[PDB]
Structure formats: C-alpha cells, structure tokens
Amino acid sequence: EVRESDHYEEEYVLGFVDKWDELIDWESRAESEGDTIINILKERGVKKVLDVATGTGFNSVRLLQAGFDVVSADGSAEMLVKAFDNARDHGYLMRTVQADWRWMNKDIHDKFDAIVCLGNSFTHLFDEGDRRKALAEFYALLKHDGVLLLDQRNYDAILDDGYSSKHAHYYCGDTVSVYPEHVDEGLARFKYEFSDGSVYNLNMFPLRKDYTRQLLHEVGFQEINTLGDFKETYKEDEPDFFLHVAEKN
Ligand SMILES: C[S@@+](CC[C@H](N)C(=O)[O-])C[C@H]1O[C@@H](n2cnc3c(N)ncnc32)[C@H](O)[C@@H]1O
C-alpha cells in the first residue's frame, strides 16, 4: 500500500545523501566550514553535545574530532548506520540513537551542554505544532545554561527578492548546484544537480529568519543571536544560510 511510497521517499533522500557524500569529501567540507561552530561551543565550555540531525554524520564526526562528548541522534535508522560507519572510517566510535524530534527524551535521558541541529534540517517540518514541539523537546534536553545551534537556508531572500533570487547556488566549488524551482510562503522545492549529472528535488518549509527566532523565543529560549552564514561558492550580498545561537538562559 502506501508503505511503498513512504519507503520511496526515505530511499530518495538516502540516495541524495549518498550522492552528496560520494562527490563531496568531508575534509574539503571541514576546511570550507569554519571552526566557528567549534569555537562557539568551546568559548561556552561545552563538553556534552547532542546532534539531533546526524544525517550521515559530518557534524557529529567533526565534534568528535574536536574532542566533544557527542550523542548522535536521527529519526532515520538507515542514516545512523551510514553515520556510524562513516565515524568508524574516521577512527571514532559514534553513539547512535534513533529518535523523533517530537519525543526526543523517549530514549535520551541525559541533559546536554549544547544541541546542534545543522545542515538545514529544521526546515523539514511542515506543521507549526511539530515545530514548537521539536524546539520544546530540544529545550528540555538542555542543561540550564545550555545552547541550541540551529541553522537554515535564507528563505527571506527567495520569498522577497523576486526575479533576482531565481538563480542557482553552488557548493563545494561546482560539485552541486541548488536551484529554487518553486517557492511560496508554505513550500520551497529545490533542484539539486551534481557534477555527474544526478538530479534530486527536495521539499522544505521556507522559514523566515524572524519566524524561526520567534519560535525559539516562544518555547522559552532567552537569548537568540542569528548569524549570516555565507556557504555558497559564488557569494552574494545576502548570506545563503543563517545560524541561530539560542541560549536557554
Ligand atoms: C539535511 S540532513 C542533515 C545531515 C547533517 N546534519 C549534515 O549536515 O551533514 C537532515 C536529517 O534530519 C533528519 N530528520 C528530519 N526530520 C526529523 C525528525 N522529525 N526527527 C528526527 N530527525 C529528523 C533526517 O533523517 C536527516 O538525516
């Protein structure tokens, strides 16, 4: 029945991350990414980190290499297998937990100095109730002085700049291009095209910057610093990403 379709959408994204990891090696990605995330955590004396969007494990492995104690959670068991084996290949024992954002402490019973939700993951929630619930679950998993690091694409530029926003964005040189095929206030569909000709189309929710900030404030975070993050190969006046640094207190 509809199990075939749900299996297809999971397999589609799994193929997407496999293609990304096939053509974009992690060392190139680590050097392109700053050490900004790591230093932010270090400056706050973070030891214990929960990654709630492990995916194939890049953020988790980077934090393990940096010396953090990391728990690697993801809603997808198949992602966590890839993440664990990638960490293994880099010489690290990952601690994987399958967990849905709407009930994060079902199987995670510890509290954390920081949570990372990176790679533009939070945009995958299309329901506002789910968005609030997810952020409340993260908030409850933080120690009193903990911090949430949560990023997203800059959807404001696409929703507002109009004709000047209808162009592709490139990552890791020219290895992948990302083109906004369709954007309205409720839905953004991007075309991802890789250097080998592979094409994937992915849906996400186009969170406005101040909306995300409003959600974070509303579930109880007391201080939110939003940083512009220029990750694309051909920089523009507007950053293509934002990084929210939300302090529980
Ligand atoms: C874009 S990937 C991020 C990968 C990694 N952070 C990186 O940048 O390399 C987003 C991940 O979040 C997970 N995810 C999406 N919705 C979720 C939910 N409701 N609960 C738990 N995980 C979810 C997906 O399984 C996927 O692995």
Residue numbers in the entry: 15 to 263
Anything the authors wrote about it?
Betaine biosynthesis is accomplished by three N-methylation steps in which glycine is sequentially converted to sarcosine, dimethylglycine and the final product betaine. Similar to other commonly exploited regulatory strategies, the control of betaine production is achieved by betaine-mediated feedback inhibition of MpGSMT, the first enzyme in the betaine biosynthetic pathway.
Indeed, X-ray diffraction analysis of the resulting crystals showed clear electron density maps corresponding to sarcosine and SAM in the active site. Superimposition analysis revealed that the structures of MpGSMT-sarcosine-SAH and MpGSMT-sarcosine-SAM are highly isomorphous; no significant structural differences were observed, except for the minor reposition of sarcosine in response to the presence/absence of the sulfonium-linked methyl group. Our finding that crystals of the MpGSMT-sarcosine-SAM ternary complex can be successfully prepared strongly indicates that the structure reported here represents a catalytically inactivated state of MpGSMT. The validity of this hypothesis is backed by the finding that crystals of MpGSMT-sarcosine-SAM ternary complex can be prepared without triggering the methyl transfer.
